[model samples]
Target: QPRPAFSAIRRNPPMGGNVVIFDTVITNQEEPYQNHSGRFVCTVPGYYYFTFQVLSQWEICLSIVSSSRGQVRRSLGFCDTTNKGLFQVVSGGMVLQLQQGDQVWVEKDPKKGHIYQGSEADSVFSGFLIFPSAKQKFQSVFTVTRQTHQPPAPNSLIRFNAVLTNPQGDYDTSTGKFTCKVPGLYYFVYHASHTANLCVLLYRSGVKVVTFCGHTSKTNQVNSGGVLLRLQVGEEVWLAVNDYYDMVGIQGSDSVFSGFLLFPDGSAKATQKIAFSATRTINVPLRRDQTIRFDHVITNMNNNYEPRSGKFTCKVPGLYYFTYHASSRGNLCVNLMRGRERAQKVVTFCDYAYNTFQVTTGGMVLKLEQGENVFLQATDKNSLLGMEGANSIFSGFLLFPD
Candidate 1:
């Protein structure tokens, strides 16, 4: 929620100009934009969705300009007091990548002189980051009610009686397990409001990963615990009572169990078991724009990723997410290559005001075919400021094939 933003002015902009600032503040969240500025400043290099719309009584047109990449035209519609309807709305949008500090604004077609905004007209500009992989994220939340087994129940999975929110059905109470649907990294947490809480263990395929402390003494004592891991297909996650446990029952329906994937390996259900990280020399290059090739492999699972060639080949198909980050004083750009084809790009600029430090990153999601190859290549080779171990990264994971 840090980057979705919109802003506009009420009325009366500077006269005799094609670039008019809709100078009233509408909804400026994340501060990428400001009032009266007539601009959207891109602070990071990533895919951004931008739009501008205004009401017109005459033939009016608007344009959104990227300080570098040219402009996108906004059309004013056909509605006039002279003809039929007295008013009409025109809007335009673009999903494009922007470099940091690139300014975007709406400009009126001076030809359409009276194309103006007033207290009644809604002239607005808006934009938001599509993927901050730069925001490595995909999330889901689930909460449950009771499925009570009254008497001598030893080892039983506390299936959520109800699912308030499970967009992917990763957590299926019918099967009583949060099966790994999207592969990548995942973290699961559960909170229990208890009467007589028994110790329960978080299990991945019947293997105990984390055990929670139970409240045996009091009533309604809240017990909570969680674990983070990467899982793949055939791997199942669930919570089980230790059986040695009793009054040690769950908080009943008041408990919640949830998790989301953090993909570096364009994502799905990862098992740490299926992902890898690769890098070139961790030292900053002597020259700028040097292409860094990852010759060394850190840890790759299943040979699906080739660190030697700096690419990941899909052995399994479905939706995948990929991302990378690096530190440097110069500009850096990373890409997710789909089958030797450049599919997504992220460009970052840093340390211009003061050249001491920075980390710029990017990511993307793709529907890959089996045997497809997605590689990590630095568009700017000389942009590494000494990666140092894991500071520079290239990662992705299969999110879902099932």
Candidate 2:
């Protein structure tokens, strides 16, 4: 516990003076600990300021109440954890009009954890007033002033801008044309203020995309029930409102609307088998101590062949050649990887009588990590690989090995 600020003052009152004060020492001087009580007498009262401070590891939350004997009016808390070491003057100079002997002092323990020390200095219970005596005819004036401020209302509109297209003329209710500035998603909201039913359709590039409707028995106020939607980039989308009753009003006409693109932010060129039209092949150069294997395969026909699973051990890291080919009848899909991680995928079509479905052959120089598992596996289903009465094959070789 911390020491109190000042010692108590004791003085007899002058005759015809309006205020009289009395003080008492209150505390619980027990072994295991307990809360104590204090008392103060008021002969006459007007307005008083009561304050106390407690020092503890835990915060000191204090409050006060008035009564004939128990608690009263308003209770205030001080010395909260968030506001430590801060002196809060709760009920500063409050009016305490008293009759002949109105009792007012620090309230007793309402809850627990309150250990009062036995000292008039540590535990202070005091008050002072402003009033006139019988000789002065009681003529003192008291006034109070308050100060505060309020904030403005919030916004109430949503908008969007996107690329749109309409295969069928579904958005011909208002405008028969669709527009697109960019490719992305857009959103908008519609609200009303009447008891009628209504429906709103959204279109993208003349294509119908979204619809919103609402029915209310009471006056359909603004923002009563609104809608939210998303669209693609460079897509021209619009709204067409259909009111069950012509009196159903529309809101959010001048509302601000906008849209932005929503797609993954990484390169989609990484390898993976896409479809069953093409097969990827590689012509690997061989070295003295290097072993090479082919791992990925895709086919359009149901050909039963154990997917070629193999590994490559490089004596030295260098550029290796790779190639891909598709059957002349069905589609072939192929994926390549160093280990379990996919490096790339090659797709081709079997109907390449005109050779228009073949992919360009390419190669990559892979840096060899000592003791690293470098391998590949054909992913084409057995049926698809065997469907064209031909097995999709992947072959490669390692070169310049140590």
Candidate 3:
């Protein structure tokens, strides 16, 4: 499914620190609004992209605010009072990973009002879900269909434009391929519909991974292939005809190519045990400056993670890969802690303020002692609101053992 999105605006600017709830609804096509009081609360956690523009006739310093971006803030756009008669415009936005209840709004600094076209409403607010939190850390899914019945020539690399679903925008429909964003284990699957004779091949990084051929005289049939592969970042996967003479028509919904991330891997283990990886999902109240815990388990493959205490104890000594992200409404700051020592941290703020929802995230990879403890911690109260949804994630696995 595509991520949620919408657009809003205020015909006039606000006069004070009061919330400038936009009244002009240009488009709410994706349903990301709640209370319509300019409170845009996120529901599906992932990377969210937002943009705002304030139109002021007078000199005004406009700013955006969220219930969660604590202590940190970024200026959207501003104009001074000694301005001209024409309305001055200021705009900007951000990408955030927010959980369920992070609310966002707009306000003015020092003062507000008479923005855009001499008190005419021209300010704008817009946002959308750029990527949805995957069940796993990596996700690449797309469905492209042929608009006509004509099939491409044999051995032709298919180019598609009608992508029905690209929630993460990971799949490039133009080139008819899905590119790996993260280095990890992946699963690829392709299914094609046909008549007469058809032979297809799936390629990884330009190398053929699998092939399938089927022949039909007067009956309808389907051919499919799926494989698990180890992929590096920037590598690409695509499909094509196996021979120059084998042409197939996908026609419609019957044709599909899809892939997704499986787990972190390396030479540490010859093979992955069902219990060798895990992901912790939660928003915490054992909040900032403290080890944040995850009570919701997304994929505890190894069962080695302790959600109640927000810790993942590695059982082997190997190069490991760990990552995390947070969301709610503001500048976010967090850290990855290895037994109290800082291993990794990410910070996002604008003159930081408040204790509400915001998103800050980071990751780390290091060798571990079998008994070492690994977890996440909020660096300050301004970061307390970052705890939310699958976006509030902590995941890791042995990349390989040395």
- Mark the regions of model 2 whose C-alpha exceeds 4 Å error after superposition: 1-37, 45-49, 69-71, 82-93, 108-123, 132-402
For model 3, the local distance difference test gives: 0.50
Can you give the lDDT of residue 388 in candidate 3?
Answer: 19
lDDT score for residue 221 of model 3? 29
Alpha-carbon runs more than 4 Å astray in model 3: 1-138, 244-253, 264-402
Per-residue lDDT of model 2, residues 1-402, tens digit only: 111111121122122211111132221111111112233344443332232322222223344335554445443222212122211111111224444344544432233123222221122233333231231121211111111111111221112221121122222223322333332212222222223443334455565433333333432211111112233334554444443321232221111111122111121221211111122234343232222232343321122112343443333233221222222122222233453233332111111012111111111223334333343223331112211212223322221111
Error of 3 at 372 (Å): 31
lDDT of 3 by residue, 1-402 (tens): 443655555544334445667665644544666424776776777655454545444455544566654333432233223244432333333445566667666665544444553332245566555446664334444444434455557777755555544556667877777888767665454445454556566678887644444444432223344445667878888777745223243221135555555454542344442222223344434456676676656446556678777787766554454544333343344455665244442211111213322222233334466667777666453333322121344566553122
Error of 3 at 112 (Å): 66
